[PDB]
Amino acid sequence: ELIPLPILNFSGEKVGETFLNLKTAPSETARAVVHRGLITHLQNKRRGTASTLTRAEVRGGGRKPYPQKKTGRARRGSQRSPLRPGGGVIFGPKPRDWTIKMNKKERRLALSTAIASAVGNSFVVEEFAENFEKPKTKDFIAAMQRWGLDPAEKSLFFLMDLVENVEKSGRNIRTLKLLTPRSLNLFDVLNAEKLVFTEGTIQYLNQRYGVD
Amino acid sequence: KGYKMKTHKASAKRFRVTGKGKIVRRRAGKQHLLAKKNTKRKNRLSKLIQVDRSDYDNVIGALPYLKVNRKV
Amino acid sequence: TRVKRGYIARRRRKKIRFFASSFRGAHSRLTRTIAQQKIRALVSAHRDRDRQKRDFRRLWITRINAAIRERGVYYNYSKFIHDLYKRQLLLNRKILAQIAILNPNCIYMIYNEIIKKED
Amino acid sequence: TRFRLDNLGPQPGSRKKGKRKGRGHAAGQGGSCGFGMRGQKSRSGPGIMRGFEGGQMPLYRRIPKLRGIAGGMRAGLPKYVPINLRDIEVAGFKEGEEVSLESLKAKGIINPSGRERRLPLKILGEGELSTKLQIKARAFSGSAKEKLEAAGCSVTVLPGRKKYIKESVRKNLARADEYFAKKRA
RNA sequence: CGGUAGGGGAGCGUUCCGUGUUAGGGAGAAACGCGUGCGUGAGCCGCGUUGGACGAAGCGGAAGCGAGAAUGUCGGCUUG
RNA sequence: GGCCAGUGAGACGAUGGGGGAUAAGCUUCAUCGUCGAGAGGGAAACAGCCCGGAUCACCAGCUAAGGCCCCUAAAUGACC
RNA sequence: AGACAACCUGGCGAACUGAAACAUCUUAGUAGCCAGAGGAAAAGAAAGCAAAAGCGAUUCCCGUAGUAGCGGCGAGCGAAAUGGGAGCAGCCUAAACCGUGAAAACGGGGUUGUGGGAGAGCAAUACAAGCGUCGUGCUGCUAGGCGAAUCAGUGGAGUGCGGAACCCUAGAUGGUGAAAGUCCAGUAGCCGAAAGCAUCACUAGCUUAUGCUCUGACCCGAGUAGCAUGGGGCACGUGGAAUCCCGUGUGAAUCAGCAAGGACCACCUUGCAAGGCUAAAUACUCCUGGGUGACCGAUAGCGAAGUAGUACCGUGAGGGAAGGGUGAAAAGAACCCCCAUCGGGGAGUGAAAAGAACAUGAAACCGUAAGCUCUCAAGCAGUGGGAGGGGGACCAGACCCUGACCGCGUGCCUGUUGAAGAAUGAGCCGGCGACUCAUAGGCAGUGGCUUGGUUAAGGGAACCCACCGGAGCCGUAGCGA
Ligand SMILES: [Mg+2]
Ligand SMILES: [Mg+2]
Ligand SMILES: [Mg+2]
Ligand SMILES: [Mg+2]
Ligand SMILES: [Mg+2]
Ligand SMILES: [Mg+2]
Ligand SMILES: [Mg+2]
Ligand SMILES: [Mg+2]
Ligand SMILES: [Mg+2]
Ligand SMILES: [Mg+2]
Ligand SMILES: [Mg+2]
Ligand SMILES: [Mg+2]
Ligand SMILES: [Mg+2]
Ligand SMILES: [Mg+2]
Ligand SMILES: [Mg+2]
Ligand SMILES: [Mg+2]
Ligand SMILES: [Mg+2]
Ligand SMILES: [Mg+2]
Ligand SMILES: [Mg+2]
Ligand SMILES: [Mg+2]
Ligand SMILES: [Mg+2]
Ligand SMILES: [Mg+2]
Ligand SMILES: [Mg+2]
Ligand SMILES: [Mg+2]
Ligand SMILES: [Mg+2]
Ligand SMILES: [Mg+2]
Ligand SMILES: [Mg+2]
Ligand SMILES: [Mg+2]
Ligand SMILES: [Mg+2]
Ligand SMILES: [Mg+2]
Ligand SMILES: [Mg+2]
Ligand SMILES: [Mg+2]
Ligand SMILES: [Mg+2]
Ligand SMILES: [Mg+2]
Ligand SMILES: [Mg+2]
Ligand SMILES: [Mg+2]
Ligand SMILES: [Mg+2]
Ligand SMILES: [Mg+2]
Ligand SMILES: [Mg+2]
Ligand SMILES: [Mg+2]
Ligand SMILES: [Mg+2]
Ligand SMILES: [Mg+2]
Ligand SMILES: [Mg+2]
Ligand SMILES: [Mg+2]
Ligand SMILES: [Mg+2]
Ligand SMILES: [Mg+2]
Ligand SMILES: [Mg+2]
Ligand SMILES: [Mg+2]
Ligand SMILES: [Mg+2]
Ligand SMILES: [Mg+2]
Ligand SMILES: [Mg+2]
Ligand SMILES: [Mg+2]
Ligand SMILES: [Mg+2]
Ligand SMILES: [Mg+2]
Ligand SMILES: [Mg+2]
Ligand SMILES: [Mg+2]
Ligand SMILES: [Mg+2]
Ligand SMILES: [Mg+2]
Ligand SMILES: [Mg+2]
Ligand SMILES: [Mg+2]
Ligand SMILES: [Mg+2]
Ligand SMILES: [Mg+2]
Ligand SMILES: [Mg+2]
Ligand SMILES: [Mg+2]
Ligand SMILES: [Mg+2]
Ligand SMILES: [Mg+2]
Ligand SMILES: [Mg+2]
Ligand SMILES: [Mg+2]
Ligand SMILES: [Mg+2]
Ligand SMILES: [Mg+2]
Ligand SMILES: [Mg+2]
Ligand SMILES: [Mg+2]
Ligand SMILES: [Mg+2]
Ligand SMILES: [Mg+2]
Ligand SMILES: [Mg+2]
Ligand SMILES: [Mg+2]
Ligand SMILES: [Mg+2]
Ligand SMILES: [Mg+2]
Ligand SMILES: [Mg+2]
Ligand SMILES: [Mg+2]
Ligand SMILES: [Mg+2]
Ligand SMILES: [Mg+2]
Ligand SMILES: [Mg+2]
Ligand SMILES: [Mg+2]
Ligand SMILES: [Mg+2]
Ligand SMILES: [Mg+2]
Ligand SMILES: [Mg+2]
Ligand SMILES: [Mg+2]
Ligand SMILES: [Mg+2]
Ligand SMILES: [Mg+2]
Ligand SMILES: [Mg+2]
Ligand SMILES: [Mg+2]
Ligand SMILES: [Mg+2]
Ligand SMILES: [Mg+2]
Ligand SMILES: [Mg+2]
Ligand SMILES: [Mg+2]
Ligand SMILES: [Mg+2]
Ligand SMILES: [Mg+2]
Ligand SMILES: [Mg+2]
Ligand SMILES: [Mg+2]
Ligand SMILES: [Mg+2]
Ligand SMILES: [Mg+2]
Ligand SMILES: [Mg+2]
Ligand SMILES: [Mg+2]
Ligand SMILES: [Mg+2]
Ligand SMILES: [Mg+2]
Ligand SMILES: [Mg+2]
Ligand SMILES: [Mg+2]
Ligand SMILES: [Mg+2]
Ligand SMILES: [Mg+2]
Ligand SMILES: [Mg+2]
Ligand SMILES: [Mg+2]
Ligand SMILES: [Mg+2]
Ligand SMILES: [Mg+2]
Ligand SMILES: [Mg+2]
Ligand SMILES: [Mg+2]
Ligand SMILES: [Mg+2]
Ligand SMILES: [Mg+2]
Ligand SMILES: [Mg+2]
Ligand SMILES: [Mg+2]
Ligand SMILES: [Mg+2]
Ligand SMILES: [Mg+2]
Ligand SMILES: [Mg+2]
Ligand SMILES: [Mg+2]
Ligand SMILES: [Mg+2]
Questions:
Q1: Residue A167: which residues within 8 A CB-CB, separation 6 or more?
Q2: C2 C-alpha to center of ligand 31: Å?
Q3: Domain count within chain B
Q4: Record's family (chain C)?
Q5: Number of CB pairs < 8 Å for B and D?
């Protein structure tokens, strides 16, 4: 690797160095690849809930000139249409699905490019799981500030484990995301200010996405 | 279940495609009144001719599943 | 996502209307009329920026003609100009018209040079 | 040079903005939208059939139906997966290796679909093989097995599935063989 | 380097989403009114003895996205 | 060759002709010009005649067709 | 018995339309009507597929495939088998025979298919499996309860700002004079049900049950199958027209049989019609409870934010509108004056009068005041030139308003060979108002992989999404009916 990574113990002293080496998008297309990967994500996340009534859903037509003036909806000699108030909506939204597709390998590429950009931030950690027994948020934040994470700026903890105490201890900070590999999004990696890995985690990422 | 385009069947019993991808058809006029057509003519009307570039549009538009190189 | 047209209309209209200030009658009121009237204004304007260049030459030439005809019985615009040229002077018609009104003695001098040399 | 949600953006040329017809003339196709004046092509709704010329008898109609199709003679269908020796050369076959069908899915040179799944294999001469390979297929072209037996390769031809023949026609086809046999001996 | 039908290239704006529970905002936001300001233009930027709480720029995404014509259509107000 | 449009009512003028009455701003063809889709000047006004093909600015200059008594730019010029 | 939105099953069953006309065909067994039942319905335990290798009731999705085919071979219609998933479940009865009757019935026995059963003899017997009153059980639902942590300053109000602190298994949400993790109700977490409901286990009990040998004589669903005709439906339009189901008429065979394998015959394979019943996977929203929203915000969203199916209109079936925002709080203006009331002007309330026809308040339209200007004048009302007069400036030679007179100047749109047209259209102003979406085919531009590329349905810490899912599909051989 072209850069080391600091490994800090639970106190915050630097114990070691690691290397996270991934498949990177060629320099030209990176911004496109990632971009696309992101767009796709956000677009599949979308639920078309916007619904209208077409000209034929609208209640209570009959085909005829109106016999008497409906104040605001029509006048005396007029024909039924979309062009009234209360008329159908021409080309209005119907419930959709926005779901598009992207190649698996392209996906993974975006993920890798993202995380391989984020190596100017990232730490590693000595796998703190045991130091939490009773869930304590106060404690988690203590630990954070020891590692130099401002409990403001939106950081990402990528671990293998969800140890219940840790899981709950982090639940209520708005700026943390605690990710298993089961939930790992391009989105959150892009979104995070600081990246945090464990040893097992680096071992995982450097394998799945390893450059040959 | 979407809608996939339907092959126009009356055009696909008429035209086909050669291995290199060009469209061909039969020639019209050998079925009857043969006696009065000279044998040289009768031979000419028996072979397979490549369809006239002009028609390619209509043809192509009605046979969406036919693999066709227009030589680009 | 429904989109009302909102103000995007009335800004355009208002910015048009500003143009049409001081048009008599309904050319200063109704938007629909005001539109047309704006176009025609801009149009005549463009036209007469071109007419202009024709017109002042018209004028200047006329004034020059009058200014010279005072001197000789037989003398013209045409004769004059011809002589300005066979004497190699560059003064164009704006300048001779302005010197005709604003410094008449000067034009008399010029004429005296042209005559002396044509003599 | 780090990626965030804000430094992202597309590649020039990728997403090209769409024509929105019927807005303004200065823009694009305004008014008419690029349909010109009137008539049937500029009218809303389903057009006329794609193969239809004006009522003059359409090209596809005035031309005679293709030979076999025209009557309902069943169309021709590939009955073997053809492989030439080219492909077998290119692939990673070391000597002694069994070619067969399976070992060509393994190295992926043939990816068969449903119809092709159910099919047998056939070997067609093209390209000059250099190696001794053990081949198993249901058929060969003449040229094929000529070049193969020339190179020193063992050609194992696989049994096709038996055709069920009723007893009487066995008696006939066997009566034949009895005749040939009594004659030669 | 005139230009209709028509084709191609480059842009502006509207509402909404991501960044974002953003910058900014009862020391006055949106809007409304103004400009000796800047644009090829769509428009932008600045200003307010109006207004009273929201909401830019940038880099991206999506459309119920731009009106002067439809004997359009609904309200309002004229003329006679 | 690919992708992908409109057009498929034309008008007059010059020339060659046919129909008609060597009638029609008539009608129908042929080789051209302009209008269509072309602004400017000359034609009193005046799609199709003459000059000329308008990127834009200039209170500069030279010319085309056409003009030089006054309306209205230039000779109330010269010689037959 | 009646009621019941959509879905479903059965019964009747169109037409515009498409075919650039139309009659076969299409629309479409759609709409509509009628009847019926359910939370789903229907279908369903091989007289089935297939092809010489195998599968093992039904339904639903992906795929095969717009393939084979059908078709005035026109418009169009359009499979299945293999393959991948979801989901799984198999049972009662007739007849032979044995009892009881005169019957008709009842009771035992008996239910299968590379055959069973009845018949005649000899062996095994105890476990296993299915159903289920009663009842404390388990869980959930129908009320609830406990629930951490802040202060002062700042112009009506502080949740904002500057400055200090704190909780977090709680930084969901709503409210509060102004935007709040720490003010209220709440949330995480944790407790809680006398009564009823629901899924589950258990629950006495009720059910069933094996094994072999001999015997082609007994049974194995009759007005049935088939056949002749008339039709219907199967992707399949009478076609060589199978399989399926009905009118009229005829009319079999029992396992040494009968049916199916796309006329038909032979052979082989597969199966057992003419008795029933069955859960799930799938469809739907008059609704109920949670949740999300690149959904609306009073011309929108339901027709309906107020008497909304109301007012009103119609004999009747039926049609069918409009009217939202004083303020934080009514503190909704005591008292005096004009004064018959309404309405107003003061005072008082209030941050503001925002004063009840009350929040921002554009345009048309109606005026009032101030600056310049029109009564010898011909004009799509402008424009270039600018006399005279006036106004706010800081680059005072500029800007802004007015406009003596001269020049030039045939509204806009549509549509036409061609228009100022006496050609169409618009009273004016503001809103609403049109190349949209889904799915496929072709082409282009961008990426990704090219150790060929890619997955579909499906599964997913709810979605998204990691990771799966190679069934398929595209490219690797053509020629030929
Ligand atoms: Mg209707
Ligand atoms: Mg509506
Ligand atoms: Mg090929
Ligand atoms: Mg023949
Ligand atoms: Mg074409
Ligand atoms: Mg909106
Ligand atoms: Mg609109
Ligand atoms: Mg003016
Ligand atoms: Mg589009
Ligand atoms: Mg364009
Ligand atoms: Mg227009
Ligand atoms: Mg077009
Ligand atoms: Mg039109
Ligand atoms: Mg056309
Ligand atoms: Mg049509
Ligand atoms: Mg249609
Ligand atoms: Mg069609
Ligand atoms: Mg034929
Ligand atoms: Mg072939
Ligand atoms: Mg293939
Ligand atoms: Mg041009
Ligand atoms: Mg154009
Ligand atoms: Mg903007
Ligand atoms: Mg804006
Ligand atoms: Mg906005
Ligand atoms: Mg802020
Ligand atoms: Mg402002
Ligand atoms: Mg806004
Ligand atoms: Mg602006
Ligand atoms: Mg901008
Ligand atoms: Mg406020
Ligand atoms: Mg922004
Ligand atoms: Mg719309
Ligand atoms: Mg209007
Ligand atoms: Mg009206
Ligand atoms: Mg009036
Ligand atoms: Mg013609
Ligand atoms: Mg014609
Ligand atoms: Mg036409
Ligand atoms: Mg002519
Ligand atoms: Mg002529
Ligand atoms: Mg001649
Ligand atoms: Mg004559
Ligand atoms: Mg003639
Ligand atoms: Mg003519
Ligand atoms: Mg000429
Ligand atoms: Mg035209
Ligand atoms: Mg031209
Ligand atoms: Mg001209
Ligand atoms: Mg002229
Ligand atoms: Mg010329
Ligand atoms: Mg030129
Ligand atoms: Mg030019
Ligand atoms: Mg000259
Ligand atoms: Mg003169
Ligand atoms: Mg003379
Ligand atoms: Mg009932
Ligand atoms: Mg009833
Ligand atoms: Mg019911
Ligand atoms: Mg019909
Ligand atoms: Mg009809
Ligand atoms: Mg028709
Ligand atoms: Mg028709
Ligand atoms: Mg169900
Ligand atoms: Mg049922
Ligand atoms: Mg079974
Ligand atoms: Mg059975
Ligand atoms: Mg299957
Ligand atoms: Mg399964
Ligand atoms: Mg099963
Ligand atoms: Mg019995
Ligand atoms: Mg029994
Ligand atoms: Mg058998
Ligand atoms: Mg047997
Ligand atoms: Mg027995
Ligand atoms: Mg409490
Ligand atoms: Mg509390
Ligand atoms: Mg405070
Ligand atoms: Mg604070
Ligand atoms: Mg809150
Ligand atoms: Mg709770
Ligand atoms: Mg037997
Ligand atoms: Mg029959
Ligand atoms: Mg039939
Ligand atoms: Mg049949
Ligand atoms: Mg059958
Ligand atoms: Mg079959
Ligand atoms: Mg029937
Ligand atoms: Mg019968
Ligand atoms: Mg019998
Ligand atoms: Mg039969
Ligand atoms: Mg069978
Ligand atoms: Mg039976
Ligand atoms: Mg049957
Ligand atoms: Mg049965
Ligand atoms: Mg049933
Ligand atoms: Mg209203
Ligand atoms: Mg409404
Ligand atoms: Mg409003
Ligand atoms: Mg009072
Ligand atoms: Mg009284
Ligand atoms: Mg009073
Ligand atoms: Mg007061
Ligand atoms: Mg007070
Ligand atoms: Mg108001
Ligand atoms: Mg007079
Ligand atoms: Mg006067
Ligand atoms: Mg006048
Ligand atoms: Mg004038
Ligand atoms: Mg005039
Ligand atoms: Mg006409
Ligand atoms: Mg008019
Ligand atoms: Mg016209
Ligand atoms: Mg006309
Ligand atoms: Mg109108
Ligand atoms: Mg009118
Ligand atoms: Mg009218
Ligand atoms: Mg629109
Ligand atoms: Mg279209
Ligand atoms: Mg689309
Ligand atoms: Mg496409
Ligand atoms: Mg590529
Ligand atoms: Mg999936
Ligand atoms: Mg799922
Ligand atoms: Mg899903």
A1: A178
A2: 28
A3: 1
A4: Belongs to the bacterial ribosomal protein bL20 family.
A5: 47
